[PDB]
Ligand binder design. Structure first.
Ligand SMILES: [Mg+2]
Ligand SMILES: [Mg+2]
Ligand SMILES: [Mg+2]
Ligand SMILES: [Zn+2]
Lengths: 147, 245, 46, 124, 98, 201
RNA sequence: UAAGUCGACAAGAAGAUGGGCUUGGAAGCAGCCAUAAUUUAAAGAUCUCGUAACAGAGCACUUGUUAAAUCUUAAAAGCAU
């Protein structure tokens, strides 16, 4: 069976490390080869940007990975101008019900959806129904939605 | 207070339970067989979720490249590839064909006040419809002559149905080449322009879909016949050619 | 095996059967479970 | 003038590419219309209501008829035929194909409560 | 039904024919990954006007080639014959492996 | 029973012979219930059973089929034997034509098996004796019942063959009774794909 | 309940998304807060396993096949174990 792995890595930071090393180094595939192959995929994004990846490890240890857009939560907080907390990354509300971190307007939601429609696997979903999927997640991270 | 004999106005006596999804889904197809002039019947073979999404991603893309600058209604999103219940969908044809709603006698109905008001039960889920379809189906040979008989063998196993709100041959070429390509009549999209079509997920899903048959204006049609309809550039243009003669 | 006076199913695979019933004795009610052998129970005393 | 963000507003942190500038808000009119309507889903003291709220509703309600007080059956339990007619037209067709989608949500919402409750009854 | 031991299947039938019903059901029983595993499948749809007798072709991974008429036998009956031959291979595989 | 209604397809070569209601006098019983001797002969052999009289067989020689039916569905005794009589005929028809087989797998270091003849303890001339090494001090030798053909393609694999399923599976359980599969190492005798869940350690 | 009840079998059981917080790690499944959406034949920000954490196997749920013409499921009551 061709197992898959989920790993969040930096934009141009591909090397043996906690996020990259143990995730795939143990299965057998050549991590170095993948590390040097990921840089070619991400050469136009700001260094350090988080980039989800779904690396499929076929039998015989022949890997093929599809780079994905940044997490919606990371974009909502990045666009919500939230105060940086532990770890140096913008943290979300500990209690989304009461606490409120940012006030993201709908015009920001219309863009966060356009950047997420670039994916072919998500290019078919209508944009009218896609902007409400992220608005449904702003209620879970403590961000208010402003008309 | 509400009396015992009173029944809600939007819930007349049904032949079988209405809360269940078996009957609630029957009310859908019956209205879909009336509002959809053009309908294509496919056969799906254990298509996965990702495959389904990919298949429906090409239709939207292929259907979005149809020129409609005549200020006509935006018929580009009501076209859906919907998986249906073949068993309950086979009954829909019966109720839509072997049932005359004009053969019901109105009867008094009691409201919350208890006043008797004449009412007629013509809903598809009525006991009268159930009785008609059953008795009508008793004659085996006479049914084969009907449109239902020409489409009963097609409603076997799993079937996915494509619904088009109108008979637009242009929309057919956009949807008939993405599901059942047959060049040079309906050639598949090019790779240098539609790379998503020739994807691992999409390509592996289109191999499990087979266009079994089609239904147009309540008329059974064979796969070869669908090409003729799709071959026509437009209906209004076809009529003009006859006038020139 | 646990000999109780109130035998109950402890999972979906537990079955209630009356075994050891023959011409000489009435038998007992058992809770047999192929998934977990700890669900084995009997009702009655020899 | 209906949106808080005026034209020319700098949308902070919406560009992760190197050779490009962060998006700049465009005029309000240029944006689609559904964006001003997609936000339609966002939803002692007891004594004060008891004095006024309890009484006012009884007066406006005009409890003299049993027509506006019926159970008001939901859409997921009725048996009336859907507004579908043969050769009614594209407008009738589309208008008929729109209620089939409004009923889809009804059955969907019912599954949520039916599944959430079935899982709640197993984790007592 | 066990499809692992089936190499390729070629079915030719007419849809509008009530007899072809059993043939269509057989095609659905096949799993999704049958194409990826390497099994070849060819489906031919005959015209509605004139219908030729339906043809069903089956072949296992041991060289056996099965051919069963669709009209005489139903879908349930066809599954039995293919199961017997596919079942003995499981025992033979376990018998000669290890 | 939903299984007793299903017709029994008699494949070519098999022949079903239905007897007549007879009663074997028993001095210990005041009234014996009539039975019917049903013979099922074919290529591999012949099996015979006696069914109650209330079960009626509509042997259709034209279409080569035989459907069962009872005289009263309301009686618990007739409903049970209806399905049980059908399940037996099904095995008989599919046992005399194709045959029944059972596979035993011997797991464990030092477990062997051979099919030799022990003329000392032969119950019938030419009896085959399965000899099993299962870690006991003595040798375990069992004689195959008359009507079964036992062979060992490999030392750690037994193959039983016969027309009577009840006899074949019963003889495979006697061999398995010596070493029942354990859950700590999987050692034992597994019959027809039987498996045991192992422990963590 | 022939609009296929009941049971079995085949497949599916998605996507935004590793929800946010917490933590060495918390990705449906230690714990805390939220749990209006969306798209679907359907799919709980998750009911029982499983992992150090992922992965993975089932469930709710969805379609199909088989198949009942007095034959589904629950409650109460009587007499028994
Ligand atoms: Mg016992
Ligand atoms: Mg969590
Ligand atoms: Mg955990
Ligand atoms: Zn149990």
């Amino acid at each position: 069976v061709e197992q898959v792995v989920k790993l969040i890595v930096g934009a141009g930071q591909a090397s043996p490390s906690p996020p990259v090393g143990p995730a795939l180094g143990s299965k057998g595939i050549k991590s170095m080869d993948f590390c040097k192959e990921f840089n070619a995929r991400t050469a136009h994004i700001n260094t350090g940007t988080p980039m989800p990846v779904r690396v499929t490890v076929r039998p015989d240890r022949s890997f093929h990975f599809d780079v994905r857009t940044p997490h919606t939560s990371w974009l909502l907080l990045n666009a919500a101008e939230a105060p940086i907390g532990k770890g140096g990354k913008r943290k979300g509300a500990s209690n989304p019900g009461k606490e409120v971190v940012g006030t993201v307007s709908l015009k920001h939601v219309y863009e966060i959806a356009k950047i997420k429609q670039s994916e072919l696997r998500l290019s078919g979903l209508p944009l009218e129904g896609l902007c409400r999927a992220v608005i449904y997640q702003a209620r879970s991270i403590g961000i208010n939605v402003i008309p | 207070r509400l009396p015992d004999d009173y029944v809600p106005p939007t819930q007349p006596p049904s032949a079988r339970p209405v809360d269940t999804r078996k009957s609630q889904l029957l009310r859908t197809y019956t209205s879909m067989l009336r509002s959809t002039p053009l309908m294509l019947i496919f056969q799906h073979n254990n298509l996965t979720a990702i495959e389904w999404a990919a298949i429906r991603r090409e239709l939207s893309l292929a259907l979005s490249n149809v020129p409609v600058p005549e200020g006509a209604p935006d018929i580009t999103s009501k076209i859906h590839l919907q998986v249906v219940r073949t068993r309950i969908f086979d009954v829909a044809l019966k109720t839509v064909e072997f049932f005359d709603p004009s053969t019901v006698e109105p009867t008094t109905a009691t409201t919350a006040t208890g006043t008797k008001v004449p009412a007629t039960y013509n809903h598809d889920l009525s006991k009268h419809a159930w009785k008609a379809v059953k008795e009508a189906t008793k004659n085996t040979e006479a049914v084969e002559k009907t449109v239902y008989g020409q489409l009963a063998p097609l409603l076997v196993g799993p079937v996915a149905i494509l619904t088009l709100p109108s008979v637009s041959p242009a929309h057919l070429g956009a949807a008939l080449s993405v599901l059942a390509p047959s060049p040079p009549a309906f050639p598949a999209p090019s790779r240098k322009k539609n790379p998503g079509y020739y994807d691992l997920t999409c390509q592996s899903g289109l191999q499990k879909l087979l266009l079994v048959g089609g239904r147009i204006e309540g008329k059974a049609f064979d796969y070869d016949g669908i090409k003729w309809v799709g071959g026509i550039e437009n209906g209004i243009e076809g009529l003009r050619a006859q006038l020139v003669h | 095996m646990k000999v109780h006076s109130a035998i109950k199913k402890r999972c979906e695979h537990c079955k209630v059967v009356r075994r050891k019933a023959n011409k000489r004795q009435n038998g007992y009610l058992y809770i047999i479970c192929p998934a977990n052998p700890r669900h084995k129970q009997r009702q009655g005393y020899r | 003038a209906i949106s808080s963000c005026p034209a020319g507003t700098k949308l902070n942190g919406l560009n992760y590419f190197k050779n490009k500038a962060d998006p700049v808000a465009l005029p309000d009119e240029e944006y689609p219309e559904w964006l001003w309507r997609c936000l339609e889903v966002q939803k002692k003291q007891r004594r004060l209501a008891m004095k006024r709220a309890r009484a006012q509703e009884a007066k406006i309600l005009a409890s003299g008829d049993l027509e506006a007080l019926a159970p008001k059956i939901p859409l997921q339990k009725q048996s009336v035929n859907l507004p579908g007619a043969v050769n009614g037209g594209v407008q009738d067709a589309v208008l008929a194909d729109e209620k089939r989608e409004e009923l889809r949500k009804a059955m969907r919402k019912e599954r949520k409560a039916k599944i959430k409750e079935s899982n709640y009854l197993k984790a007592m | 039904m066990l499809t692992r031991f089936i190499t390729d299947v070629s079915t030719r039938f007419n849809p509008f024919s009530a007899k072809a019903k059993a043939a269509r059901l057989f095609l659905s029983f096949l799993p999704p990954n049958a194409r990826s595993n390497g099994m070849n499948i060819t489906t031919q749809l005959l015209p509605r006007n004139s219908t030729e007798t339906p043809l069903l072709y089956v072949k296992f991974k041991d060289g056996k080639e099965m051919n069963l008429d669709v009209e005489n036998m139903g879908i349930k009956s066809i599954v039995e014959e293919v199961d017997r031959h596919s079942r003995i291979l499981q025992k033979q595989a376990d018998l000669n492996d290890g | 029973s939903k299984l007793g209604r299903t017709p029994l397809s008699i494949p070519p070569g098999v022949e079903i012979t239905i007897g007549e209601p007879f009663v074997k006098r028993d001095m210990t019983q005041w009234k014996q219930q009539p039975k019917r001797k049903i013979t099922v002969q074919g290529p591999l052999g012949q099996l015979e059973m006696d069914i109650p009289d209330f079960i009626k067989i509509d042997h259709d020689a034209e279409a080569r089929r035989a459907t069962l039916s009872v005289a009263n569905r309301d009686e618990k005794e007739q409903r049970e034997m209806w399905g049980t009589t059908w399940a037996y005929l099904n095995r008989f028809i599919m046992g005399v034509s194709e045959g029944h087989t059972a596979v035993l797998r011997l797991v464990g270091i030092g477990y062997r098996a051979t099919i030799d003849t022990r003329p000392e303890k032969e119950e019938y001339p030419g009896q085959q004796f399965v000899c099993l090494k299962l870690g006991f001090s003595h040798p375990v030798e069992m004689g195959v019942p008359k009507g079964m053909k036992a062979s060992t393609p490999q030392p750690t694999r037994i193959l039983l063959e016969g027309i009577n399923r009840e006899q074949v599976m019963t003889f495979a359980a006697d061999i398995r009774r010596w070493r029942v599969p354990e859950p700590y190492k999987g050692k034992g005798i597994f019959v027809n794909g039987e498996t045991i869940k192992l422990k963590q350690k």
